[PDB]
Amino acid sequence: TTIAGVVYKDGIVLGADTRATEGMVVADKNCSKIHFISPNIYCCGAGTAADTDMTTQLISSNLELHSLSTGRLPRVVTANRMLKQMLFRYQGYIGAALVLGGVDVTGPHLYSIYPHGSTDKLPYVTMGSGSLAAMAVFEDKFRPDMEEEEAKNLVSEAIAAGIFNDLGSGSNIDLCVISKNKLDFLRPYTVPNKKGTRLGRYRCEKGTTAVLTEKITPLE
Amino acid sequence: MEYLIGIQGPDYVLVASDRVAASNIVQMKDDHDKMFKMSEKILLLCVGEAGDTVQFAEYIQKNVQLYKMRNGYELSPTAAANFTRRNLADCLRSRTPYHVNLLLAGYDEHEGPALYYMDYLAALAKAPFAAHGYGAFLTLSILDRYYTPTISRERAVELLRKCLEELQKRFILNLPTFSVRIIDKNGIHDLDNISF
Amino acid sequence: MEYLIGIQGPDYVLVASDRVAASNIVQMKDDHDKMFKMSEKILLLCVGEAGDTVQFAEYIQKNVQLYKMRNGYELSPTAAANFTRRNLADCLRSRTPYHVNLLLAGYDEHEGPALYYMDYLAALAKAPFAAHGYGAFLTLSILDRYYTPTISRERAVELLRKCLEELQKRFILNLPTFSVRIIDKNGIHDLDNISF
Amino acid sequence: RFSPYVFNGGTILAIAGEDFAIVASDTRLSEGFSIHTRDSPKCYKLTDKTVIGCSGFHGDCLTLTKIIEARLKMYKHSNNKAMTTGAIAAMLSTILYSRRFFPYYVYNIIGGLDEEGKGAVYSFDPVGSYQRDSFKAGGSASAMLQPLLDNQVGFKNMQNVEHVPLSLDRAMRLVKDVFISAAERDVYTGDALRICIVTKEGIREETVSLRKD
Amino acid sequence: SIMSYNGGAVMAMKGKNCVAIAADRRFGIQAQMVTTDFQKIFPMGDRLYIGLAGLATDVQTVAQRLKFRLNLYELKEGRQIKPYTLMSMVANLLYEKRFGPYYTEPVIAGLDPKTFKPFICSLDLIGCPMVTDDFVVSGTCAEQMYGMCESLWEPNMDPDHLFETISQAMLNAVDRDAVSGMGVIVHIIEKDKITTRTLKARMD
Amino acid sequence: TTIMAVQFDGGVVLGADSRTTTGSYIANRVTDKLTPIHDRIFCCRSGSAADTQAVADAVTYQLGFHSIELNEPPLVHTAASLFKEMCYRYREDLMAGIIIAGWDPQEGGQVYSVPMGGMMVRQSFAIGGSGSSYIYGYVDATYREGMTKEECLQFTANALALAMERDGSSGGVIRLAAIAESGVERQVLLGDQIPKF
Amino acid sequence: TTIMAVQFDGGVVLGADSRTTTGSYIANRVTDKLTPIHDRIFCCRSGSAADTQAVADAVTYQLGFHSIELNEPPLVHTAASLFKEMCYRYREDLMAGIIIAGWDPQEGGQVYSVPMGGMMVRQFAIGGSGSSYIYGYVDATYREGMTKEECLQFTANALALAMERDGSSGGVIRLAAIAESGVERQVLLGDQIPKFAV
Amino acid sequence: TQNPMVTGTSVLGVKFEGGVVIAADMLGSYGSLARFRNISRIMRVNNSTMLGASGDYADFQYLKQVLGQMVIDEELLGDGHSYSPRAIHSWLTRAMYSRRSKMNPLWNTMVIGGYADGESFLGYVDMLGVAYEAPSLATGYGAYLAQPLLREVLEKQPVLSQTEARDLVERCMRVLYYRDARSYNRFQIATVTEKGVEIEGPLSTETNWDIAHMI
Amino acid sequence: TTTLAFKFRHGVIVAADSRATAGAYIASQTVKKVIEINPYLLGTMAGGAADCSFWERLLARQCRIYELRNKERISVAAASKLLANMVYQYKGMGLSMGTMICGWDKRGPGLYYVDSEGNRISGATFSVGSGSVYAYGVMDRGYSYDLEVEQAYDLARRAIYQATYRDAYSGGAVNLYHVREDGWIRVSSDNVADLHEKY
Ligand SMILES: [Cl-]
Ligand SMILES: [Cl-]
Ligand SMILES: [Cl-]
Ligand SMILES: [Cl-]
Ligand SMILES: [Cl-]
Ligand SMILES: [Cl-]
Ligand SMILES: [Cl-]
Ligand SMILES: [Cl-]
Ligand SMILES: [Cl-]
Ligand SMILES: [Cl-]
Ligand SMILES: [Cl-]
Ligand SMILES: [Cl-]
Ligand SMILES: [Cl-]
Ligand SMILES: [Cl-]
Ligand SMILES: [Cl-]
Ligand SMILES: [Cl-]
Ligand SMILES: [Cl-]
Ligand SMILES: [Cl-]
Ligand SMILES: [Cl-]
Ligand SMILES: [Cl-]
Ligand SMILES: [Cl-]
Ligand SMILES: [K+]
Ligand SMILES: [K+]
Ligand SMILES: [K+]
Ligand SMILES: [Mg+2]
Ligand SMILES: [Mg+2]
Ligand SMILES: [Mg+2]
Ligand SMILES: [Mg+2]
Ligand SMILES: [Mg+2]
Ligand SMILES: [Mg+2]
Ligand SMILES: [Mg+2]
């Protein structure tokens, strides 16, 4: 997994690859790692897939409860607090490693959240097995107050570095662009990897497989 | 180890178990009974860890009997097998797991004879014949070789005798006598012990 | 587990051993022989770890035979017992220890009958009767109960039969047949196998 | 605690034809979740008519191939002829077994021509257990490759199919296909596929591109 | 390995307006085969099936506890469950046991009960869901199954082609697994009918 | 990590490096390890980032409520006490070394150490973190009674710089805070601003 | 233990504490950890007392014989090399951190570290358990071009600071100055040891 | 070595048109302690070959001694034959594998750079005897942090000039200083060309810490 | 693996499956588990494949040298003793071997079980391998010394077949050999899937 986020001039760019592995085998080629928290807040997930899924879903529904009550747009700090306090309670047994980004009334905010429940507020972050490759790109090329297209290019370069250098990362790049004015959930953004064409066809006729018993049940 | 065997015929189930209770290097009992009557047409055969076997089997026994008293009719073999599995599976991840391996043999009026195999993990399988214990390793292939679904009660007993003789010949443990019972439409019948 | 037994009478030694070779849960051989002829009037009975038993016993055998060829006369039972012990004790702290338990039975012209017990640590003891194996736990007390130093060969055989019957009754392993031999002034005699 | 072994990845494949043999491998060298290089073939030419594929611990692959190369020359010097495919296979069995108590962490497949000019494939476990095969996959993705070969080359589980001889053209298409499929699922298999075709004319090589992720 | 104790393999595959699901039939304890007709695929509706590989006890428990929850759902809501909702219901059941999990990794295959649109997914043992448009595999021969599926699968297969593809994928995969096989059952789900077949298979 | 605090007449100076490591990878090179607990009370955090953030957030809550009830600025000693109670009670579940420093109208500038185990001691100055080993000799030789605020800033900057050179687990920028009656002044030393030797 | 050596123009200054501990019992409180290897070559010993005494005795033998064969005063670098060869070859069997310091007519005053593992580097040098506590001090205090008197003071101060903090260091400070003119040894005890307020 | 003591971190290497450049910082770490801050981890082997080493510094000094003597031995013969970079790399592979097989490894990962017969050489050898050639190399944390940047540039432009390769190496050394906790902002760069082996240092990278005001 | 052998009136029957596994993965379905030591001696492979192949190939070497030196073929007793002595030196080093040495010498049909644990025993019938328990069952119920040649073939074939049914680690094809006075013959090779059709 390679996930990353940057703060640009007008908001947040989140990025992710789309590979999920079980052991050293690719289970999912088109896994979605950028999770909805609220219309203005998204979250990339690394670590234990079930843990990041369930954790983000829970905080998302709690934030919906929160915002239905307040009538106000949720704050990134609220999502951050709710995630870290729950993760701390479980003492690292919930293996959710999260890149949380959003735009609220106080502007754009980006946090990294680790399974034990520590958080960092930062202008760029990476997580996953491909995080050092992605961070190399950021350290090399990050500038403050980047334009939207520059920030998108930087994040997609960071993910790509993970895709090509980390065995745990691959397939597509997904981006999520969050500003005050818009949300662009780009899935996929780029498809650097494609399966090669098949040279021979294995189209087998009816009767190739020997059948022992057959039962047909008609339906209504 | 303890040995259990079941053979389902067209309208009967034949079951047998060793009669030894062992402790360390000695046989402590040579007329042990590993079979529990659940109802008029159901036997539960239970082996495994000391304490666990009798505690579990007698719990199922009293619950199957309670069902009859409450409802005026008995659990079917299939219902009893699933009840047994539910209890064992429920205890699997609890503070009180039961390390028992079971056969359940029964005759239903509408469904005919049935034989169920259950391991301590509480996986349940219906089988035409089945065996538990180290002895099963030496006898299952004899059953596979000679068994047919239409086997008569007379032949089933001789096929059982073949399995038991194999234990005498090839098995390293001294298992000289076996309980033998048959279940049919007329209930549970005690056959002669097979002895060596 | 393997069983060895010896009974020394006034002018003879009677010995017996089980005839099973076991591997895991199966008997692989039911006519195994655990006795090794050292000379005309000496038997070595050897049990223990696979490989070690036959390697050690055959090494002693060839050395006892070499002694005879070199000197024109045979080792006495006592000399053979000590030779055996020396070799086993010498290997105890080496790269090649032998995990074997032994009985040595013999008749000397001047000393009369002798029975020696040796464990894998290579402690040697002369005994009027002795046994090796888990079976020994169940039989030594029967020997203690019934043995007298003047026991006749007829009675020794019946006392052996009592021990063997106890194994059939009480011992958890299947040991159905036993090698039986007697040594006297006329050498080694093969008696009938005791079978169940 | 020092460990003398590491897993370096790699998939090897060989197919025996009537008058040809194919040895194929990917070119990726891995360690942990990292790639060392994208250009590391696992095939080595032994003679004009014998190629060996080697995967596993790269340290052992390098050492073993250098040992084989030396042994070939030694044999040629004392016997006055080149080693046959069968003799190489037999010899390698003994080399691998010489380290029975500290094994070469290697999976080997030999592909070439026998003395009648027919294709021969030999596959080995790390301690030199070996046999002749019609076709064989080894290394990282071998459980992915082997079932399709059983089906397509061995005609397993197929009714109403004529068991035609295997042409080079069909063999080459099968090799490419299984590797492209493996490159989809096995994280260790990728970058490029290197194919060696052994015929009476000699050994020619072909390379096809694979996914870089 | 706990997941290899009983062995087993299941896969699902997507066609044009149809789905397929297949399973081996072996029930074994380590090396020893016990029965050759163990059910691993359970109906969860007229056009919706779940297949479970893993620990045999947990295969049965999850099947039974899921049916419990589904029966209650259908009575309450007065409609058949959509495939995606069953996946969520399963995910929820598995994740409840996050810290003491069931040792089963299910696959779901069905048609939407109103649109008849094909759906397949799989979940890990703690209920992480994975939806695909091609195929899903689960069991002790996952690698063998991936190799066959990647090679054989094509989009928009008709029921007859889909049958052959999943049959050949399963047969040739399990034949490279010591603890999978002893027969294969295949269900083809269509709008108007279910077709159930057992295949001629090796019994070693 | 290296953390440090110094008392002067009328306030305190706090300082920390900004390095957060996982093994020998720097996950955050601009960490903020000086956490405000109240208007004029700070803590310097070392140990588990999860533990110190959780404990700090909890104390902030406790001291904030307490301060409203009493309707007065909280004592630095009270802040330290609240840290000590948590760090002691959960000593088997925490890896946290804290320095509490600040100003109150009753006692002025105060520095308290709450090391692992949860003992509490007032000190003229305090050091903590893995990096503090390397500067014990320096601080013992350099410290002088009656230092001004400017001198305390310099003393802290120097000590941290020295620790940062030697300790692989320390580095990045130096964060400084001065706390007095008049309020809190924060600054960062980066690059050439960091003392060189 | 804390050990230290400093180069100046025309020689070296060596220093050590005098504490030898078994656990937290002080077995010897007046240990001599500066061992002469030749006329103008010393080593400071830290780690296992068995190991450093054995290695020092062996090197003394080797360098003494070598010096007779060549009929010249030995190089400090040669002494260091002999320590390095032994400490490297037997790195798995030794627990020794050595500083070699002295004077030769060819290269003048020289300091070499031979830490655990048996690498060799010319440097001033510090070692022992106590040296952790004075890295910051020496880094801040060291100045290029220090006189002999300043080196003695620098060494006395650094050792005193380490001795206060490190339970495994303490006792007296042993100092040695080595130059062309010879070896000058002294002991700092009690009030002579530099004092710093708590 | 069973247990490394004083160690060095990443070594980098990249081929360029007419030569090879390698880089390594000048630090020997003792655990987390930055203990020896002015040691060289690069070696001139001969006129065509250079070598940089990660890992145990004592084991590196041993290899310097052995390999240094080997080149002296060859020069004594004056026979017009000289060890190529490829030959040194081969020797190193054999030596490392040999020590690994004795369960007594030299605890090093090494980068060999060379120029001979108008050809750039760049080779890797680890403590287990794993060896290969590549257009760019990075050991240790460099493998995770520097190699992705190296391979990124070489993808868009396979053939670099000397100045381009030098700029790229300086950029990678900056990244390692930012992200590797065992690194140090004092490094050497060694270049091999037709003219021979040059070693420059000590060098420093300029750093940017603006993101410290972005919390 | 399942291998069996038994002496009877007309010699020694030897049979084996052909499956090799690496964990749960089937590496081969065409392993030759009956090893042709010489024209008058067969051995069998169970346990470690390399261990059996290597050591029995070493036995074949030693037996041939013996024949050349002594001008007569080695006995079954002596051949099995050679192998036992070879592997005994390696006890506790993790060799995995269970073999049957089968032949016909001056004492008639010969059959020894030899393993890496150090066992060497003469016997009328043996079965070795993960599947041996299942083969014992069938073989024991059918075995007789006075069995006819075709009856001996059927029993050996059926016993292996039944083992492949129950034992996950046994399968492929059933390979059958007959040791006669003038040497062994290869009797048959039947795929288990074909035998299923038959039985
Ligand atoms: Cl927060
Ligand atoms: Cl990850
Ligand atoms: Cl439930
Ligand atoms: Cl923090
Ligand atoms: Cl608060
Ligand atoms: Cl602390
Ligand atoms: Cl602290
Ligand atoms: Cl710290
Ligand atoms: Cl930093
Ligand atoms: Cl001396
Ligand atoms: Cl040291
Ligand atoms: Cl030291
Ligand atoms: Cl020390
Ligand atoms: Cl002292
Ligand atoms: Cl240095
Ligand atoms: Cl150099
Ligand atoms: Cl075959
Ligand atoms: Cl011979
Ligand atoms: Cl025998
Ligand atoms: Cl086996
Ligand atoms: Cl038959
Ligand atoms: K791949
Ligand atoms: K630092
Ligand atoms: K002290
Ligand atoms: Mg904690
Ligand atoms: Mg219990
Ligand atoms: Mg031994
Ligand atoms: Mg990748
Ligand atoms: Mg199978
Ligand atoms: Mg010592
Ligand atoms: Mg099988």
PDB file of all heavy atoms in Angstrom, chain G residues 85 88 91-92 116-117 119-120 123, chain H residues 1-2 5 56 58-59 61-62 65:
ATOM      1  N   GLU G  85      44.533  -5.674  15.742  1.00  0.00           N
ATOM      2  CA  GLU G  85      44.614  -7.019  15.191  1.00  0.00           C
ATOM      3  C   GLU G  85      44.022  -8.045  16.160  1.00  0.00           C
ATOM      4  O   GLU G  85      43.296  -8.939  15.735  1.00  0.00           O
ATOM      5  CB  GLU G  85      46.045  -7.368  14.773  1.00  0.00           C
ATOM      6  CG  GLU G  85      46.495  -6.666  13.498  1.00  0.00           C
ATOM      7  CD  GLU G  85      45.792  -7.110  12.222  1.00  0.00           C
ATOM      8  OE1 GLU G  85      46.033  -8.259  11.779  1.00  0.00           O
ATOM      9  OE2 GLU G  85      45.017  -6.299  11.660  1.00  0.00           O
ATOM     10  N   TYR G  88      40.148  -7.242  16.860  1.00  0.00           N
ATOM     11  CA  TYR G  88      39.331  -7.598  15.712  1.00  0.00           C
ATOM     12  C   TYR G  88      39.228  -9.114  15.565  1.00  0.00           C
ATOM     13  O   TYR G  88      38.134  -9.634  15.353  1.00  0.00           O
ATOM     14  CB  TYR G  88      39.842  -6.962  14.417  1.00  0.00           C
ATOM     15  CG  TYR G  88      39.006  -7.322  13.218  1.00  0.00           C
ATOM     16  CD1 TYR G  88      37.719  -6.822  13.072  1.00  0.00           C
ATOM     17  CD2 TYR G  88      39.476  -8.205  12.259  1.00  0.00           C
ATOM     18  CE1 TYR G  88      36.932  -7.159  11.982  1.00  0.00           C
ATOM     19  CE2 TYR G  88      38.704  -8.548  11.158  1.00  0.00           C
ATOM     20  CZ  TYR G  88      37.424  -8.030  11.027  1.00  0.00           C
ATOM     21  OH  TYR G  88      36.638  -8.360   9.954  1.00  0.00           O
ATOM     22  N   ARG G  91      37.048 -10.556  18.344  1.00  0.00           N
ATOM     23  CA  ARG G  91      35.941  -9.665  18.666  1.00  0.00           C
ATOM     24  C   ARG G  91      34.771 -10.427  19.293  1.00  0.00           C
ATOM     25  O   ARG G  91      34.030  -9.851  20.085  1.00  0.00           O
ATOM     26  CB  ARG G  91      35.501  -8.841  17.449  1.00  0.00           C
ATOM     27  CG  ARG G  91      34.925  -9.649  16.294  1.00  0.00           C
ATOM     28  CD  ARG G  91      34.551  -8.773  15.115  1.00  0.00           C
ATOM     29  NE  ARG G  91      33.489  -7.841  15.466  1.00  0.00           N
ATOM     30  CZ  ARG G  91      33.035  -6.869  14.685  1.00  0.00           C
ATOM     31  NH1 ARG G  91      33.597  -6.634  13.512  1.00  0.00           N
ATOM     32  NH2 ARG G  91      32.020  -6.125  15.088  1.00  0.00           N
ATOM     33  N   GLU G  92      34.618 -11.716  18.968  1.00  0.00           N
ATOM     34  CA  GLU G  92      33.501 -12.480  19.503  1.00  0.00           C
ATOM     35  C   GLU G  92      33.808 -13.003  20.909  1.00  0.00           C
ATOM     36  O   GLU G  92      32.905 -13.481  21.589  1.00  0.00           O
ATOM     37  CB  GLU G  92      33.010 -13.549  18.519  1.00  0.00           C
ATOM     38  CG  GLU G  92      31.765 -13.118  17.747  1.00  0.00           C
ATOM     39  CD  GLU G  92      31.934 -12.000  16.726  1.00  0.00           C
ATOM     40  OE1 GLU G  92      32.622 -12.252  15.713  1.00  0.00           O
ATOM     41  OE2 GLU G  92      31.388 -10.880  16.937  1.00  0.00           O
ATOM     42  N   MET G 116      35.031  -1.658  20.792  1.00  0.00           N
ATOM     43  CA  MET G 116      34.543  -3.019  20.648  1.00  0.00           C
ATOM     44  C   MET G 116      34.241  -3.295  19.174  1.00  0.00           C
ATOM     45  O   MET G 116      33.676  -2.449  18.482  1.00  0.00           O
ATOM     46  CB  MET G 116      33.283  -3.226  21.492  1.00  0.00           C
ATOM     47  CG  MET G 116      33.586  -3.475  22.953  1.00  0.00           C
ATOM     48  SD  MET G 116      32.105  -3.768  23.941  1.00  0.00           S
ATOM     49  CE  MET G 116      32.606  -2.965  25.464  1.00  0.00           C
ATOM     50  N   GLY G 117      34.653  -4.477  18.702  1.00  0.00           N
ATOM     51  CA  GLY G 117      34.550  -4.823  17.293  1.00  0.00           C
ATOM     52  C   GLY G 117      35.905  -4.764  16.593  1.00  0.00           C
ATOM     53  O   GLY G 117      36.124  -5.469  15.610  1.00  0.00           O
ATOM     54  N   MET G 119      37.659  -1.922  15.284  1.00  0.00           N
ATOM     55  CA  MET G 119      38.013  -0.926  14.285  1.00  0.00           C
ATOM     56  C   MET G 119      39.085  -0.022  14.899  1.00  0.00           C
ATOM     57  O   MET G 119      39.283  -0.028  16.113  1.00  0.00           O
ATOM     58  CB  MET G 119      36.797  -0.105  13.844  1.00  0.00           C
ATOM     59  CG  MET G 119      36.371   0.946  14.845  1.00  0.00           C
ATOM     60  SD  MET G 119      35.086   2.046  14.190  1.00  0.00           S
ATOM     61  CE  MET G 119      36.038   3.546  13.952  1.00  0.00           C
ATOM     62  N   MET G 120      39.796   0.735  14.059  1.00  0.00           N
ATOM     63  CA  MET G 120      40.838   1.622  14.556  1.00  0.00           C
ATOM     64  C   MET G 120      40.713   2.982  13.874  1.00  0.00           C
ATOM     65  O   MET G 120      40.595   3.056  12.656  1.00  0.00           O
ATOM     66  CB  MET G 120      42.231   1.037  14.294  1.00  0.00           C
ATOM     67  CG  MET G 120      43.362   1.899  14.839  1.00  0.00           C
ATOM     68  SD  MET G 120      44.973   1.219  14.380  1.00  0.00           S
ATOM     69  CE  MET G 120      45.644   2.596  13.451  1.00  0.00           C
ATOM     70  N   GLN G 123      42.155  10.078  16.345  1.00  0.00           N
ATOM     71  CA  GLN G 123      41.292  11.182  16.738  1.00  0.00           C
ATOM     72  C   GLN G 123      42.120  12.314  17.367  1.00  0.00           C
ATOM     73  O   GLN G 123      43.165  11.980  17.973  1.00  0.00           O
ATOM     74  CB  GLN G 123      40.204  10.684  17.693  1.00  0.00           C
ATOM     75  CG  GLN G 123      39.257   9.675  17.055  1.00  0.00           C
ATOM     76  CD  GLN G 123      38.059   9.375  17.920  1.00  0.00           C
ATOM     77  OE1 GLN G 123      38.133   8.616  18.884  1.00  0.00           O
ATOM     78  NE2 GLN G 123      36.933   9.973  17.569  1.00  0.00           N
TER      79      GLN G 123
ATOM     80  N   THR H   1      31.706 -11.648  12.038  1.00  0.00           N
ATOM     81  CA  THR H   1      30.831 -10.800  12.891  1.00  0.00           C
ATOM     82  C   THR H   1      29.493 -11.498  13.121  1.00  0.00           C
ATOM     83  O   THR H   1      28.780 -11.812  12.169  1.00  0.00           O
ATOM     84  CB  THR H   1      30.623  -9.423  12.249  1.00  0.00           C
ATOM     85  OG1 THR H   1      31.917  -8.895  11.966  1.00  0.00           O
ATOM     86  CG2 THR H   1      29.871  -8.451  13.129  1.00  0.00           C
ATOM     87  N   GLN H   2      29.168 -11.735  14.397  1.00  0.00           N
ATOM     88  CA  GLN H   2      27.834 -12.162  14.786  1.00  0.00           C
ATOM     89  C   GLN H   2      26.988 -10.923  15.092  1.00  0.00           C
ATOM     90  O   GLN H   2      25.786 -10.914  14.838  1.00  0.00           O
ATOM     91  CB  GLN H   2      27.871 -13.094  16.002  1.00  0.00           C
ATOM     92  CG  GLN H   2      28.679 -14.377  15.818  1.00  0.00           C
ATOM     93  CD  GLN H   2      28.379 -15.148  14.553  1.00  0.00           C
ATOM     94  OE1 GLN H   2      27.225 -15.362  14.178  1.00  0.00           O
ATOM     95  NE2 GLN H   2      29.436 -15.565  13.874  1.00  0.00           N
ATOM     96  N   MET H   5      29.008  -3.649  15.351  1.00  0.00           N
ATOM     97  CA  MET H   5      29.271  -2.701  16.421  1.00  0.00           C
ATOM     98  C   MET H   5      29.122  -1.285  15.863  1.00  0.00           C
ATOM     99  O   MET H   5      28.002  -0.792  15.757  1.00  0.00           O
ATOM    100  CB  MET H   5      30.658  -2.912  17.036  1.00  0.00           C
ATOM    101  CG  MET H   5      30.794  -4.216  17.813  1.00  0.00           C
ATOM    102  SD  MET H   5      29.789  -4.393  19.317  1.00  0.00           S
ATOM    103  CE  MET H   5      30.107  -2.849  20.158  1.00  0.00           C
ATOM    104  N   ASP H  56      29.229  -3.009   9.241  1.00  0.00           N
ATOM    105  CA  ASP H  56      30.255  -3.033  10.274  1.00  0.00           C
ATOM    106  C   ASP H  56      31.560  -2.439   9.740  1.00  0.00           C
ATOM    107  O   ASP H  56      32.130  -2.929   8.767  1.00  0.00           O
ATOM    108  CB  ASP H  56      30.387  -4.425  10.896  1.00  0.00           C
ATOM    109  CG  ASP H  56      31.317  -4.460  12.095  1.00  0.00           C
ATOM    110  OD1 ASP H  56      32.541  -4.537  11.881  1.00  0.00           O
ATOM    111  OD2 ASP H  56      30.815  -4.370  13.234  1.00  0.00           O
ATOM    112  N   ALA H  58      34.567  -2.158  11.207  1.00  0.00           N
ATOM    113  CA  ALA H  58      35.736  -2.992  11.451  1.00  0.00           C
ATOM    114  C   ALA H  58      35.907  -4.030  10.340  1.00  0.00           C
ATOM    115  O   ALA H  58      37.029  -4.292   9.919  1.00  0.00           O
ATOM    116  CB  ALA H  58      35.661  -3.636  12.813  1.00  0.00           C
ATOM    117  N   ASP H  59      34.796  -4.611   9.867  1.00  0.00           N
ATOM    118  CA  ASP H  59      34.834  -5.617   8.813  1.00  0.00           C
ATOM    119  C   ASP H  59      35.226  -4.976   7.482  1.00  0.00           C
ATOM    120  O   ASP H  59      35.844  -5.627   6.641  1.00  0.00           O
ATOM    121  CB  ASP H  59      33.492  -6.330   8.649  1.00  0.00           C
ATOM    122  CG  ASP H  59      33.170  -7.338   9.740  1.00  0.00           C
ATOM    123  OD1 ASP H  59      34.107  -7.765  10.464  1.00  0.00           O
ATOM    124  OD2 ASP H  59      31.973  -7.692   9.859  1.00  0.00           O
ATOM    125  N   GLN H  61      37.274  -2.303   7.256  1.00  0.00           N
ATOM    126  CA  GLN H  61      38.703  -2.036   7.371  1.00  0.00           C
ATOM    127  C   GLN H  61      39.493  -3.304   7.057  1.00  0.00           C
ATOM    128  O   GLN H  61      40.577  -3.233   6.490  1.00  0.00           O
ATOM    129  CB  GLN H  61      39.076  -1.489   8.752  1.00  0.00           C
ATOM    130  CG  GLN H  61      38.535  -0.092   9.019  1.00  0.00           C
ATOM    131  CD  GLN H  61      39.137   0.526  10.256  1.00  0.00           C
ATOM    132  OE1 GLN H  61      39.096  -0.046  11.342  1.00  0.00           O
ATOM    133  NE2 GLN H  61      39.695   1.715  10.106  1.00  0.00           N
ATOM    134  N   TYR H  62      38.933  -4.460   7.418  1.00  0.00           N
ATOM    135  CA  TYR H  62      39.582  -5.733   7.150  1.00  0.00           C
ATOM    136  C   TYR H  62      39.647  -5.980   5.645  1.00  0.00           C
ATOM    137  O   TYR H  62      40.688  -6.388   5.138  1.00  0.00           O
ATOM    138  CB  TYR H  62      38.878  -6.871   7.892  1.00  0.00           C
ATOM    139  CG  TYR H  62      39.307  -8.252   7.464  1.00  0.00           C
ATOM    140  CD1 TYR H  62      40.541  -8.771   7.829  1.00  0.00           C
ATOM    141  CD2 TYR H  62      38.480  -9.033   6.669  1.00  0.00           C
ATOM    142  CE1 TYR H  62      40.930 -10.042   7.433  1.00  0.00           C
ATOM    143  CE2 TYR H  62      38.857 -10.299   6.257  1.00  0.00           C
ATOM    144  CZ  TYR H  62      40.085 -10.807   6.643  1.00  0.00           C
ATOM    145  OH  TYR H  62      40.444 -12.068   6.228  1.00  0.00           O
ATOM    146  N   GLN H  65      42.181  -3.800   3.974  1.00  0.00           N
ATOM    147  CA  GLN H  65      43.501  -4.364   4.204  1.00  0.00           C
ATOM    148  C   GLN H  65      43.768  -5.507   3.221  1.00  0.00           C
ATOM    149  O   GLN H  65      44.803  -5.516   2.565  1.00  0.00           O
ATOM    150  CB  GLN H  65      43.614  -4.791   5.670  1.00  0.00           C
ATOM    151  CG  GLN H  65      44.944  -5.422   6.048  1.00  0.00           C
ATOM    152  CD  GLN H  65      44.873  -6.064   7.412  1.00  0.00           C
ATOM    153  OE1 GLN H  65      45.453  -5.579   8.381  1.00  0.00           O
ATOM    154  NE2 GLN H  65      44.137  -7.161   7.502  1.00  0.00           N
TER     155      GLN H  65
END
